[PDB]
Amino acid sequence: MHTAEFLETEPTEISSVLAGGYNHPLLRQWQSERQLTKNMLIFPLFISDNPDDFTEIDSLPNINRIGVNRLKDYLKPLVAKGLRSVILFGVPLIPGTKDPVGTAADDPAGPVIQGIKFIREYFPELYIICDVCLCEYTSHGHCGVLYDDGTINRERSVSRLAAVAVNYAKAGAHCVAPSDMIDGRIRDIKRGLINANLAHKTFVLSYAAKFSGNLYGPFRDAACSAPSNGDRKCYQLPPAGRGLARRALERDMSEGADGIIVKPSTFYLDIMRDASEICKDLPICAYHVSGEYAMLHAAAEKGVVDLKTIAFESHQGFLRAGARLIITYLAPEFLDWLDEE
């Protein structure tokens, strides 16, 4: 009948034997080129012009639109658990705010700058990052200033963005993160900070490789940033554009970025590895975007994976691929989990 056949084998070659390096729990930690720590985390905040706001963004599980009067009580526990950094997005809902050139983006009475002043006053040790763009402030929902045919106007757009970024830094932001993907905007932002005598204390964290695709969903609600007039494929990178992403990384580093962000993260880990070579002397940041985070939550409550397990697997994923910073909506969860681990 049928029995187990065993082939005649040669002595073991040393070259074959990898197992001595990962047979114990502590070893699978020795095997990581970087470990996750609390100060690596950056938590997004969506700031309302309604100062009493604390509204659920139904598309973005466990995250709300908060106003300045409710921020202190929100951030206090977070800071106590070790949160070191926030990335501000403003969501101004008061009618008549939005205009073709994003005027309210750097309105001193606006949610972002008020947010910056609040946080500097009440949490002076908190590192403040501001998203720099016009899409939450424009009428058409696009990231820049447009010509009449609805295409982006590079020159006015970047001239406007430089202004907004410097104005955030003037207000007290420690770092500006331009998310517009419009050609050459980092040069102009850097030049504006230099002219304003702020380049020596403002970190330019460029979304240098921000891709177009199906993972932005939950955010647009969180920011009411739904476009008007077509899609953002003419400046967001196309998912297959590795070459364009490599050139964008090189470009933004040349134009003054102190750091770079790759967005989305899990679906673009190879681009993070690319970045780890091109921008080896710069901090690389992963942005765990709303669709990725929401995907994890859905699969979890469907029983496909465990939330905390897949959270650690994916965020360890970022560090493996070369990131040393992480923008994530699971930051509250990790400030808890990292005490145990």
Ligand X SMILES: *C(C[NH3+])CCC(=O)O
> Would you please indicate which residues are annotated as catalytic (active-site) residues?
210, 263
Q: Does the protein bind a second copy through residue 107 (CB under 8 A)?
A: yes
Binding to Zn ion by residue 132, rule CB under 5 A? no
Residue 194 touches a second copy, criterion: CB under 8 A? yes
CA dihedral for 81, 87, 92, 93, sign (positive or negative):
negative
Which one, 44 or 322, has the nearer CB to a second copy? 322
Task: Output 48 or 265, the one with its CB closest to a second copy.
Answer: 265
CB 115 to a second copy: min, Å: 17
Applying CB under 6 A, among 131, 136, 252, 255 the residue interacting with ligand X is: 131
Answer yes or no whether residue 320 interacts with a second copy by CB under 8 A. yes
Q: Which residues are annotated as a binding site?
A: 133, 135, 143, 220, 232, 290, 329
Choice from 47, 91, 143, 325 touching Zn ion (CB under 5 A): 143
Per CB under 6 A, does 168 bind ligand X? no
Q: Which stretch binds ligand X (CB under 6 A): 48-56, 150-158, 211-219, 315-323?
A: 211-219
Question: Contact between 290 and ligand X (CB under 6 A)?
Answer: yes
Nearer to ligand X, 289 or 319 (CB): 289
User: Tokens representing 290?
Assistant: 């709303």
Q: Name beta bridge partners: 105.
A: none
Chosen residue from 18, 95, 124, 125 binding a second copy by CB under 8 A: 18
- Smallest gap from Cβ 196 to ligand X, in A, equals 23
User: Which amino acid appears at position 239 of this protein?
Assistant: P
Among 135, 171, 294, 327, binds a second copy (CB under 8 A): 294
> Please, which residues have CB within 8 angstroms of residue 176's CB and are 6 or more apart in sequence?
129, 130, 132, 165, 168, 169, 189, 193, 202, 203, 204, 205
Q: With respect to ligand X, which residue has the nearer C-beta, 11 or 116?
A: 116
> β-pairing, 54-56 with 64-66?
antiparallel
Distance CA(325)–CA(304), nearest Å, equals 27
Q: How many residues does the chain have?
A: 341
Q: Give 167's contacts (C-beta < 8 A, 6+ positions apart).
A: 106, 113
Residue 144 binds: one of Zn ion, ligand X, a second copy, none (C-beta under 5 to 8 A by kind): none
* 143 contact choice in ligand X, a second copy, Zn ion, none (CB below 5 to 8 Å, kind-dependent): Zn ion
- Near a second copy by CB under 8 A, which window of 41-49, 87-95, 299-307, 328-336? 299-307
Nearest to 293 by CA among 79, 63, 35: 63
Q: Count Cβ atoms within 10 A of the Cβ of residue 140 and give its class: 0-12 exposed, 13-18 middle, 19 or more buried.
A: middle
Q: Does 219 bind ligand X (CB under 6 A)?
A: yes
- Distances 288 to 43, 234, 333 between C-alpha atoms, Å: 10, 23, 14
138 forms part of the interface with ligand X (CB under 6 A):
no
- DSSP 8-state code for residue 13: P
DSSP for residue 108: T
Asked if 41 touches ligand X (CB under 6 A), the answer is no
Count interface residues toward ligand X (CB under 6 A).
7
Q: How far is the CB of 304 from a second copy (least distance, A)?
A: 5
Question: 204 pairs with which residues across the strands?
Answer: 176
CB 66 within 8 A of CB 49: no
On the CB side of 162, CA atoms within 13 Å amount to 23
For the record, the structure tokens of 239 come out as: 């998912």
User: Which residues bind to ligand X, rule: CB under 6 A?
Assistant: 131, 179, 216, 218-219, 289-290
| Residues at the interface with Zn ion (CB under 5 A) | 133, 135, 143
